[PDB]
Design a protein around this nucleic acid. Structure first.
Lengths: 258, 158, 134
RNA sequence: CGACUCUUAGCGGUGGAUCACUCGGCUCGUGCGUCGAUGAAGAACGCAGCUAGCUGCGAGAAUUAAUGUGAAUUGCAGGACACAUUGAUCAUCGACACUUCGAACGCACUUGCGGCCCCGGGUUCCUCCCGGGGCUACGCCUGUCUGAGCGUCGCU
RNA sequence: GCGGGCCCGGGUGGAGCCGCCGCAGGUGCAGAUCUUGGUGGUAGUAGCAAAUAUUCAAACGAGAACUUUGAAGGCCGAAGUGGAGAAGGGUUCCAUGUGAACAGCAGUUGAACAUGGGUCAGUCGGUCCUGAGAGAUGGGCGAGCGCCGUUCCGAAGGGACGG
RNA sequence: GGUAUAGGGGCGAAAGACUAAUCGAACCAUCUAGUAGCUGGUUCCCUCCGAAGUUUCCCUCAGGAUAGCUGGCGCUCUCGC
RNA sequence: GACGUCGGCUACCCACCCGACCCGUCUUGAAACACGGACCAAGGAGUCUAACACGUGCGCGAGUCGGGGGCUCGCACGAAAGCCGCCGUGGCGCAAUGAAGGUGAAGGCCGGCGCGCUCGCCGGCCGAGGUGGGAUCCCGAGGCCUCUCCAGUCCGCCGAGGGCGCACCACCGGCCCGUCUCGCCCGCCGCGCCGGGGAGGUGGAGCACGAGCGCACGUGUUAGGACCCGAAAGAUGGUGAACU
RNA sequence: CGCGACCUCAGAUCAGACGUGGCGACCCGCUGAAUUUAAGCAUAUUAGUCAGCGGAGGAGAAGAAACUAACCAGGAUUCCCUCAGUAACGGCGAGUGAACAGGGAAGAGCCCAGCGCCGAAUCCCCGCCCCGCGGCGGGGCGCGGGACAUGUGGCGUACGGAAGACCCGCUCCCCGGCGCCGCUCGUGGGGGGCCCAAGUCCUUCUGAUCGAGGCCCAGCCCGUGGACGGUGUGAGGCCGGUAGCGGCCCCCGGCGCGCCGGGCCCGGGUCUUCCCGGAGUCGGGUUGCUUGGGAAUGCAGCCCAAAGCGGGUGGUAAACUCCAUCUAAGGCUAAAUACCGGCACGAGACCGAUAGUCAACAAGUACCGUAAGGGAAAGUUGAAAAGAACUUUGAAGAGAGAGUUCAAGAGGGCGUGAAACCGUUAAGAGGUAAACGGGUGGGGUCCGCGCAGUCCGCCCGGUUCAACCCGGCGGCGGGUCCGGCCGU
């Protein structure tokens, strides 16, 4: 916000009708440049901006817990389907399997070199390779507002517990560490895009079911929560349209446009 | 000016409210400060419960509720006398005592006396000096549990 | 990244600190790396430059293999003047062209009682850190 | 084809517009949360080799002492230093010091007039004079000293 | 591309910038006798006309109508265009040097600029006294900063000779 | 020259004259970004639809409310099937 | 037709013919002898908070919610994010009507007992009524046929006609609360200035097998400075008799 | 005719201390309006607000019921949600507007007068000795003084207390000093100081690389360090730093163990006897202000003016009658609470020199007014001054050569240098002011052709292998679901 005293610190009075001036509050007297100039107006030099910004603007927004859970569940579901991950820009061409589950020995890792070797062996190192080229200079005032450097997002890493994995995967650019119990939608779907490349541990992958639950079992870690129901199950409409049941009750299409 | 069936309302914004607007941008910092102070107090009183003194069973006035049971300000003097606990010693042992409470019904008095009896039964009293004098508990039940009790001590459940 | 909440990591404040740092802080700021031989011998990565040290220019127009002696250290200009990095003015008089310490390598150190103890302290800390790493 | 005038383009004039930079602001949050008669806030006047302003300092006046660091400050000379020496510059600063007004304090505000003690010059306390040093403002608390009362009383 | 606008070519420039999917705003100017700053026609125009008046020769000087010197003619005509003060100004006073800027032309000149110098008290005045008046203590008022009043509801002289 | 009277106050041989180029109520700062049914202005393109100065009430007549004129969002149905 | 010849709708200058009065605004009427306007560059005016109303998008759904607090972190990313016997203290809705004492939403059919008395009391059954218009769904005679005559199960289209009838509209009834009139009976811990029940009109923002809660966005109305600029005035506290 | 006590009252430059003023973001006690709204305006609203005065701290105030409630009751104060825009107030209009309970943050209780018991058992000042003295204390010795009986100290205060009887169990709390072992959570408490990883590697551009390519695995090495800044561009590895239960040297704080000097003979329950309450105060009338408080919520000048099974409250005035709840007219107290001022920090979906504080720079500066007060404009050469030596015209300002720089086409108000406006060169034109729209024509600017441009793209005519087999590999589809998994 701007200071409340801005513009009104001066003592300006408007010259009435009878003078060539345009009825604007001007500075009283003096033998300086700023004398009979004009103040208290948004259009005047110095002046006071129209509708000054106030601190008590409604900065924060409230979101329903169920809606947030729905969004994070959708993001976790779209972490699969390699089409979405590739369309999000993550290079997973050499990944053996998109639900990349790794052993629990990663938590024992405490060296960034070990982390890099693990990423290279898992073939996720190409994403960090792309992030290194993506490192560049931001355009605009962000350079002088402590936002000078920008880079792409690397592969996310989900861990069940912190035993040194956070320390190991900390100097690698783009890597974001997430605990299963404390997953963040803002990091699972950067920029509002549902695609994301994630690397799971065995314990975290098994604990996902205890965190969210299946369709026939409660979460058992969230007091009252179940997965959202599908509006339509057979999502592939191409299979449905050319099914014998539908085509048995269709007229002959007319494509003899006159 | 009213326009085609709007609700008739009277906003209370005729004073200089902008000068007395109270923002809440310090809410998370205040929560962090309170959490730090609570942890510091818990570390200060190492074997004492984090919540604090025991609170008595209390019912509610205002027949609107009339059934809910909550924690009281302190144990009554008659309750302490029935339980055989001195009012001044109760403060030093960790029993909340207030001298304003009355006792009209016997059920509340007996419930509070039973609560005091249970608290003294499951109370471990460390000696004033390392060499244990009389009324001090045995060293057997001192090494096993020298930690705090999270949450209210003996929570009240309706 | 930096995790200490008392470090600045801000452009304006860091530039203000750098350009308004006192003389003793500027002495540490105007540090130059040691040669390969000196680094291998003393186990010191770099040392602050002195008035009369042998030095080679690595970057700039005066890049070369000449081992010139520093003439002076202008800490107000954040620069040093060395023996033979100079240019002739219009009137023919020679003036030393300033070279930043970061673009220069020390070939010979001026060893004093304070210099030797600084080298010893740096080597001891380096060895302690390496032992902790091992 | 002249001179003048109108339009467009190149170059050259007044102007500092746009963009890119920013030791600066605005807002939020955290810890601490401390002035003074042992002289506060503020003001005046002086202090550098060359010094006007800003900043710093107070006749010890671009700073004294001590600690930490360790070879400079620098616009020029002078240079002190032997940087194998408490040792150049800087930061810290706990010791010393801190001109005149200012609650401002001998009376007033002209920078004028004084009183009570001590010391030196002058003297041989000899009062003048000169210079230096300490006190001399109001209200109020405890205690001390000296006092007033046709106030209350007891003896002569 | 109807259009808001946009993509290439050339010249200057030297250090950051943009396309797409979403979010946010101090988001689009021809006017408000709009605010700030700059520039035009007017225009080389109005004007440099209040108080009689200048001329000759020489000197310095690159440069002379304005400086200096000498001579001639004039005015202020002792309630002066003279010689000293009070208030006010504060170095404007003196000498040297310069002609960047000012003296609405010019200037070798100046009260301009840069260097240096200048104010000497027992007797001249402040200092002392009181006038109209202002303003403390005592006292009164006042929520309070303070106000009322200068002899008024005061134990108001700390002085002096002699013993 | 000194001094006294200071703003709904002073002072006035009285003119509403003077009170620092202002006086039928001085100047500075704040409330204050005081209020205005009254002036003035109100910033890019294209496409579609597109008006009223009329009803009644109001210390109402340079204005509002109410119907009217208008736009948008739709929804329920019939069918050159 | 091809080494001084081609194409360049658009943009540079010039000429010709026709048309053509300077923009913005108040106004029934502006080119106006109506007002602002020399020119250029930069700035410049419907914003934000809160309360509503409607519409739209999402989540849950007779439920919905995160306000506040607590548990995880030393805040890079974070003052973010996750969780709570706090999961609901509490707000909205699920119940309304009276000033209030208060009351407070369902009936119908069948058999029996009192005289079926359009009234009361015992058991069983059906369980949100009815009419008209109602998108859609069901049955659907029969027809259309097939290289020949008959029989003939199947894939069909049309299908007169006959029905169950969503949502919604009009009406008739029914129920709850306040009120008016006429009237007859029920109960007892206290038999009374007790309490309850019926029928017929009427008033209500009501019931009649529900639709709300949270978030976001758009428009409109307001309180705030409130689209921007503009007064003549009023109050509080201080400064001026160097002019007069 | 005096002296000696006491009560009232003065003088001291008497001995030792205290207050004055400033800041004032937050707080406390007073005083206190009008613009505005009500479409006018007078009650109301703005508003216990601006302005004015006084007084402190790091917080202040408040605070442990003369309380809330009518319930099966709760139990100091303060803050958040809710109660609630509700009850209630208002030309009942505009508008104003709480409290109870409930859920949380925090949570700590107490002390006098009086009544009474103890030989005033109490306190202050001066002298000497010992410890220690930079927030002047402890003990001992003083027929050394003073205050106090017009009341100091111990017990004791509403939750009862005191004194005896005799039931029970037994003997630690604090102060002032002298030392000692553990560096004590952001994971080593606070402050200061000094240090801790890795390419200036080989080519290639540039004025200069921090640019581009490569270097036993995206490339060379570190990575608990890939934040940031500087360095002649865009640097993890050139430097300072960053990360770290990393290292070293000092000072301070508290938590703990030993010693000395001390003060301290400190309880619970039953029974018996006594005692226990703040006056010009409550309350009533009154009037003025205030409040939602309405036959008067609270604060008050004036008058009246108490009582003790008494007094207050129970949201409609009064009388009678039972109830429920506290004990006023005395005092202390941290915590959750606020903080546009002061010291030191961190951060930004904020502005980027007509913007952001008035002030990015010698800004409350220059300057204006007698004064209260008013109050600006003003950033950028260059990587490095390398800031143009020297010759020449001119008195000089100014040029012409020469030189530095990648660049002065960057020359001391010098980065980029637009428009209005002006000077000059080139072209065109010119008696209905200029200018504009539609349609052509003429001349230029260059653009795309060409030394023909006949644009090609498929089918047809005039060096090896497909065709066809062998071996290997991979892929698709299928059923006897063949066999096993999978799966509703």
């Amino acid at each position: 916000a701007v200071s409340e005293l801005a513009g009104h610190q001066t003592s300006a009075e408007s010259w009435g009708t009878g003078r060539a001036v345009a009825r604007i509050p001007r500075v009283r007297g003096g033998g300086t440049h700023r004398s009979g100039q004009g103040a208290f107006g948004n259009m005047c030099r110095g002046g006071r901006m129209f509708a000054p910004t106030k601190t008590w603007r409604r900065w924060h927004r409230r979101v329903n817990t169920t809606q947030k859970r729905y969004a994070i569940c959708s993001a976790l579901a779209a972490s699969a389907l390699p089409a979405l991950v590739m369309s999000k820009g993550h290079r997973i061409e050499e990944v053996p399997e998109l639900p990349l589950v790794v052993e629990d020995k990663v938590e024992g890792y405490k060296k960034t070199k070990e982390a890099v070797l693990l990423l290279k062996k898992l073939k996720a190192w190409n994403d960090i390779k792309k992030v290194y080229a993506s490192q560049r200079m931001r355009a605009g005032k962000g350079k002088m507002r402590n936002r000078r450097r920008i880079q792409r997002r690397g592969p996310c890493v989900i861990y069940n517990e912190d035993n040194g994995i956070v320390k190991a995967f900390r100097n690698i650019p783009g890597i974001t560490l997430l605990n299963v119990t404390k997953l963040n939608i803002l990091k699972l779907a950067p920029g509002g895009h549902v695609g994301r490349f994630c690397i799971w541990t065995e314990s975290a992958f098994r604990k996902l079911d205890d965190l969210y639950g299946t369709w026939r079992k409660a979460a058992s870690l969230k007091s009252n929560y179940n997965l959202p129901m599908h509006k339509m199950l057979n999502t592939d409409l191409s299979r449905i349209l050319k099914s014998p049941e539908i085509q048995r009750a269709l007229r002959a299409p007319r494509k003899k446009i006159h | 000016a009213p326009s085609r069936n709007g609700m008739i309302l009277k906003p209370h914004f005729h004073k200089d409210w902008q000068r007395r607007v109270a923002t809440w941008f310090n809410q998370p910092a205040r929560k962090i400060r309170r959490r730090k102070a609570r942890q510091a107090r818990a570390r200060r009183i190492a074997p004492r419960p984090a919540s604090g003194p025991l609170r008595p069973i209390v019912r509610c006035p205002t027949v609107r509720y009339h059934t809910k049971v909550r924690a009281g300000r302190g144990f009554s003097l008659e309750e302490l006398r029935v339980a055989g606990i001195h009012k001044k010693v109760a403060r030093t042992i960790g029993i909340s005592v207030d001298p304003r409470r009355r006792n009209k019904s016997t059920e509340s008095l007996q419930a509070n006396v039973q609560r005091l009896k249970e608290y003294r039964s499951k109370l471990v009293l460390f000696p004033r000096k390392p060499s244990a004098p009389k009324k001090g508990d045995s060293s057997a039940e001192e090494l096993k549990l020298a930690t705090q009790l999270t949450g209210p001590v003996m929570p009240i459940r309706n | 990244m930096k995790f200490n909440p008392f470090v600045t990591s801000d452009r304006s404040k860091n530039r203000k600190r750098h350009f308004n740092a006192p003389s003793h802080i500027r002495r540490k700021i105007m540090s130059s790396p040691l040669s390969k031989e000196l680094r291998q011998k003393y186990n010191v990565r770099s040392m602050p430059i002195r008035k009369d040290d042998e030095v080679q220019v690595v970057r700039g127009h005066y890049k070369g293999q000449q081992i010139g002696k520093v003439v002076q250290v202008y800490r107000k200009k954040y620069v040093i003047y060395i023996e033979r990095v100079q240019r002739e003015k219009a009137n023919g008089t020679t003036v030393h062209v300033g070279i930043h310490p970061s673009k220069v390598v020390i070939t010979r150190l001026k060893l004093d009682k304070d210099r030797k103890k600084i080298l010893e302290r740096k080597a001891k800390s380096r060895q302690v850190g390496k032992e902790k790493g091992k």
